[PDB]
């Protein structure tokens, strides 16, 4: 027999490449390749392939690009350095409920005007979570990082993007119900672009993601190792209704030539606490399903207890919710309060000085939004950690563990079209 060379052979190997974005908003960018209105999906009969969501470099690219965009989009904005001044500040008491006592403060200070030789006396209402008592206050992070306000015209809506492989590469999708984080699956198809993934940023409860189709999925590395996070994907949504009931106004204060600070204004109507409403019966059925599935790894008669949270900072102990461009830190307690052998109202706090992906060295100021905010989201899954009885509680961590829940189905491979085989022919 003789060597015969074949070109265009259907052979692939694991690979890492950068991916293309396909699709004014802070992440949308509006510089992505328009998507294919009629994308193809090609089924591969008799192909079994191995996937591993915990070692998937698509997660790392999503993380790196979203952070880089955050800065590329918010970098060319007004700095708030002039606000790191001693503030004189007292409590807002004029028309408040009991739940809001001490929550808001009326601060006033001496700040630079359009002319550098003149000062103005201005005021703003700040949330308690943004100041430090030295009646004299400092803003949080004036001793740690520079604070830049976000540009008021930039939207923070989690508009979905698609990732696309370069020619010569392809993305394999694992179309397999009941497939956990790792191992082979018998159902694979080839796509050029991923499904659209919304860059939703949250902690503890995953919002507006994909649903499982047959059962609540519990995906984790090891399971028995309690140092790892458990990603729980619901097969049904739980609807959650969040609100910020106070009717706000805002002020534009010049801080020098070409720049202005967005200060909060006065509040219209009475002052009430922000909150989220989770349908109660829906939540109770949803956890019952989570429990039945958890028992498969812990024992059929094992008690599964749900606790509120571990101790920690707001980014750990409260639900992190970003809607309308406002930043909420919700109590998330009472949702996880059972042993398993109307609506739930979750009190929620608001904070304007944000330290997010870059934990230190940089801060962003969320400008106020006038009017009242009402936001409705889908709870699609949980981040849980584990401690006769097993105890579970809401967890958190870097965003990579949340984004990987939308990318567990994908792997990047390279095409190797050139190869040989023995045949009965010759040159």
């Amino acid at each position, epitope marked *: 027999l003789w060597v015969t060379v074949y070109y265009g052979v259907p052979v692939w190997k694991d690979a890492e490449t950068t991916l293309f974005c396909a699709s004014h908003n802070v992440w949308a960018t509006h510089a992505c390749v328009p998507t294919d209105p009629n994308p193809q999906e090609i*089924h591969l009969e008799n192909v079994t392939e191995e996937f591993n969501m915990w070692k998937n470099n698509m997660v790392e690219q999503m993380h790196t690009d979203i952070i880089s965009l955050w800065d590329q989009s918010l970098k060319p904005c007004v700095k708030l350095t002039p606000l790191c001044v001693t503030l004189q500040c007292t409590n807002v008491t004029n028309n408040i409920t009991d739940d809001m006592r001490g929550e808001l403060k009326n601060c006033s200070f001496n700040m630079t005007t359009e002319l550098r030789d003149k000062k103005q006396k201005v005021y703003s209402l700040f949330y308690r979570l943004d100041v430090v008592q030295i009646k004299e206050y400092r803003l949080i992070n004036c001793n740690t990082s520079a604070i830049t306000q976000a540009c008021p015209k930039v939207s923070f809506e989690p508009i979905p993007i698609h990732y696309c492989a370069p020619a010569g590469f392809a993305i394999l999708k694992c179309k397999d*119900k009941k497939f956990n984080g790792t191992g082979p699956c018998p159902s694979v198809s080839t796509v050029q672009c991923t499904h659209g993934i919304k860059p939703v940023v949250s902690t503890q409860l995953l919002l507006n993601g994909s649903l499982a189709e*047959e059962e609540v999925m519990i995906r984790s590395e090891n399971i028995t190792n309690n140092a790892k996070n458990i990603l729980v994907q619901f097969n049904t949504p739980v609807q959650i209704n969040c609100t910020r009931p106070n009717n706000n106004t805002r002020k534009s204060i010049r801080i020098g030539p070409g720049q202005a600070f967005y200060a909060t204004g006065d509040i219209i109507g009475d002052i009430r606490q922000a909150h989220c409403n989770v349908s109660k019966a829906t939540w109770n*059925e949803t956890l019952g399903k989570v429990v039945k599935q958890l028992r498969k790894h812990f024992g059929n008669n094992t008690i599964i207890r749900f606790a509120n949270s571990s101790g920690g900072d707001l980014e750990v102990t409260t639900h992190s919710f970003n809607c309308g461009g406002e930043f909420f830190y919700c109590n998330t307690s009472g949702l996880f309060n059972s042993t398993w052998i109307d609506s739930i109202t979750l009190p929620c706090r608001i904070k304007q000085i944000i330290n997010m992906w870059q934990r230190i060295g940089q801060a962003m100021y969320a400008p106020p939004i006038q009017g009242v905010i009402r936001c409705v989201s889908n709870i699609t899954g949980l981040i849980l950690t584990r401690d006769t009885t097993e105890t579970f509680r809401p967890g958190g961590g870097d965003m990579r563990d949340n984004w990987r829940s939308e990318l567990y189905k994908y792997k990047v491979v390279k095409i190797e079209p050139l190869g040989v085989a023995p045949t009965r022919c010759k040159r």
Partner: antibody
Framework: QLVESGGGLVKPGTSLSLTCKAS?????????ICWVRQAPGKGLEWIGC???????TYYANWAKGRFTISKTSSTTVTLQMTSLTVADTATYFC???????????????WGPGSLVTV | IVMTQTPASVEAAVGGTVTIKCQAS??????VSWYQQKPGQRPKLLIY???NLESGVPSRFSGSGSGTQFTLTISDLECADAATYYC???????????????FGGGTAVVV
């Protein structure tokens, strides 16, 4: 526990809704309920399935546009024929396929079935 | 959209053994269930997957298979244990679901 109804003799060209109920069970569990046909003298043929926690359905290719499946009450399901012909005379059964490992293959609860004659 | 069955009809003496065989047009792992249907009755499940019997099923029923080749062996045949046996693919390799998705058969086992 599954009991079929809505059968009987119907005229060619009409539509038909068959239903069944689970006596003693809520369907809000990890179940597939599937409809299976058997013409007299023939083997068993798959029509389609409904997943009950998240209503999603799957159909046999031959059944597309001819049959639809839906859930109604928490304890009942339905199979709707969009048109009937004489070739559709058969015994119809609903059955529950429970959860074992990686496979909802525990097709152990079958109703007695009902007959549809056209 | 997966299974086919080939033996059609088999006869055996009481106490004898028969086998039947099914094939899949697509690889389906071990996802094949088996049923026993007596005349005039709704079918009974015998086998969950290629290698697993349902509790209550006599030990004389056994089987194996993988990929596309699946079989059922019925030993120690009892008198008048006549039935039509069937195969079901419990895995749909196209949609990824794992539920009964295609059924077929016919064995006429008579004893």
């Amino acid at each position: 526990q599954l009991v079929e109804s809505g059968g009987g003799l119907v005229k060619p060209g009409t539509s038909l809704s068959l239903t069944c109920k689970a006596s003693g069970f809520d369907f809000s569990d990890n179940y597939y309920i599937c409809w299976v046909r058997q013409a007299p003298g023939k083997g068993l043929e798959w029509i389609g399935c409904i997943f009950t926690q998240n209503v999603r359905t799957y159909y046999a290719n031959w059944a597309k546009g001819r049959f639809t499946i839906s859930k109604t009450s928490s304890t009942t399901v339905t199979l709707q024929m969009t048109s009937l012909t004489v070739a559709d005379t058969a015994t119809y059964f609903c059955a529950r396929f429970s959860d074992t490992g990686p496979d909802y293959g525990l097709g152990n609860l079958w109703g007695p079935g009902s007959l549809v004659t056209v | 959209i997966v299974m086919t069955q080939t033996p059609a009809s088999v006869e055996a003496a009481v106490g004898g053994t028969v086998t039947i065989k099914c094939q899949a047009s697509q690889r389906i792992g071990s996802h094949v269930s088996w049923y026993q249907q007596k005349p005039g009755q709704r079918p009974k499940l015998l086998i969950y997957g290629a290698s697993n019997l349902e509790s209550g099923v006599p030990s004389r029923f056994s089987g194996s298979g993988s990929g596309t080749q699946f079989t059922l062996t019925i030993s120690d045949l009892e008198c008048a244990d006549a039935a039509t046996y069937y195969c079901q693919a419990t895995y749909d390799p196209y949609t990824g679901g794992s539920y009964g998705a295609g059924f077929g058969g016919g064995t006429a086992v008579v004893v």
